[model samples]
Target: APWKKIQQNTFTRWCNEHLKCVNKRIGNLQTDLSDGLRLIALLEVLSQKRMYRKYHQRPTFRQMQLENVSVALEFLDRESIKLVSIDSKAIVDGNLKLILGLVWTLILHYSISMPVWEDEGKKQTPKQRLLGWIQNKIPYLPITNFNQNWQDGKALGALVDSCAPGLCPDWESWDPQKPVDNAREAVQQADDWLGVPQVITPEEIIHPDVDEHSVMTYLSQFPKA
Candidate 1:
């Protein structure tokens, strides 16, 4: 739908203009601006002309009162950046929450909507999960001195409490010799169990790559707290 919106010439012109204005207003952030621009440019290409064509229309003053409605809608012209599966691995040794928070600074800079992790009462798709992961994680930016031994690929340390006890699989007493022997297990158990695509192959083991080189990386980019 985006490609159906505008001519190439017009989209390019508008994108350039918008970038100039955005950079002028926020360029002092230095590296932050550059990184943010990377995602903005990506969005421009992904959405193609449709994104630009719908960019904020010039404000029209009527009866000496500026149309605040138009002013707000104008913010929608910006782009959003989404981290993918690759991003999770790249975030090695970094605080997941802090990394996502810095990403929010860029999204806010461009007036793009933050990705959502949950909606209504249903589970989010992979893309939705990615968005929500970052969104929820952003509030707790600045992961301080995270342990190098801590890993991101593994499952969290606990099963559900009183509420929502049946949302995910339960593997407590795990057995390497007999994986089926475990249910509601510990971290390693959950991680190993979750490694494979269970629904895809009902009886095959799924082996995922586990690397440890990135165990202490500081996951941050923007300075906004």
Candidate 2:
């Protein structure tokens, strides 16, 4: 029938779109995982050495925020490693959806929840400023009144919890709606304040050059832990 033909075509188009988006995000995951691992490794070494002040003699809001969010970076790195076999068609068509859901949750955790820890020096503190910044950075804003495939995607977290119980503390208590709500709030609160974040000096930057000799030697001696 004509109706059936139309329905099938729509379904096919949407499936292709989903696959395209997934492939794009999978590429992002690769980059994020690699960079995350290196950063975490670097931090681990610095932490062991107790060298925080060398980087920031007097830390600003962004540095403080980075410290809080670094835990989520490590968390994302570990879980993303499990999902790295995404190139397999079977995996992509199956568990990968759930894995991707978990990935999005971690992203929300970092972008949304972590900012609440920023300095409250001003009435419109750095937290609000950072939230606004994140809201602006979102490429595609979330649409609430649609058939939510991503929300369904969140069921993947349950699958993960079953296999690795207590992997993330109170993960079972996680409300998927929390991230969605925070995202909406972030967008709404985007221009609520005009607080300027502190500027970082050139000397404060951590120069991690893989090609440079000294850096390469340092990385070579970097411990696995």
Candidate 3:
């Protein structure tokens, strides 16, 4: 989704402070790998979850994200604070990186495909658009169930599918990874998120830009929250 002013400011501040805390926790970017992974996990979860919720039915991505961004900033400033903490010494030993990698792939998948609905061409329904998009992304990421992207590739994207060696080590083993299990862990851990994220509205259902329709439609659908 295109970012608004408040959203941009929110993420920018959080990212800046988050970088500092991550550096301090890891102590020297040259050696400490886990710290980087931890930070990435936190960020990936925050961004992806916020987007997920917004897509479903809660707040607009901007609304949910403002709070998430705020929380990330807090974690960054405190340095000791954790947004999605989990004990990882056990649970597969440094599996956090895999988790982060999984989130990265998932988020990228969502990000790349999301604009399709917002930018409709009438060639497919919302569900069709979403399905087609995920089909391509999941196969590219290395996972147990999805390892056979060319064959057994189902249209589902989940955490369990992200724990194997991929085209590179950065996501599966070494650098560019983060914790997999935490409060931010997907509640289903499967492929339920493939549906419409609750972000669309009848008014906004027409095309690429749904700013007004999204705002008005959301308030109409959910007034209690």
Best by lDDT: 3
How do the residues 76-153 of candidate 3 rate in per-residue lDDT, one tens digit apiece?
334432324433231123353343333233223333323333222336633344344333344565432211221211
- Tell me the TM-score of each prediction against the true structure: 0.21, 0.19, 0.21
Clashing pairs in 1: 93-217, 117-132, 170-184, 171-183, 171-184, 171-185, 172-183, 172-184, 172-185
Candidate 2 TM-score versus the reference: 0.19
lDDT of residue 60 for candidate 3: 40
When sorted by lDDT, best at the front, the candidate numbers are: 3, 2, 1
lDDT of 1 at 111: 26
- Candidate 3 runs further than 4 Å off: 1-33, 37-93, 96-130, 133-225
Question: Which one wins on TM-score?
Answer: 1
Per-residue error for 205 in candidate 2, Å, reads 35
Per-residue error at 18 for model 3, in Å?
16
Please rank every candidate by TM-score, starting with the best. Answer: 1, 3, 2
Task: List per-prediction Cα lDDT, in the order shown.
Answer: 0.27, 0.29, 0.30
**Over the stretch 102-188, how does candidate 2's per-residue lDDT look in tens digits?**
333422333233334322233453234433432332224432211231232232233223223443224345565554432222222
Question: Which 10 successive residues of model 1 have the least lDDT summed?
Answer: 216-225
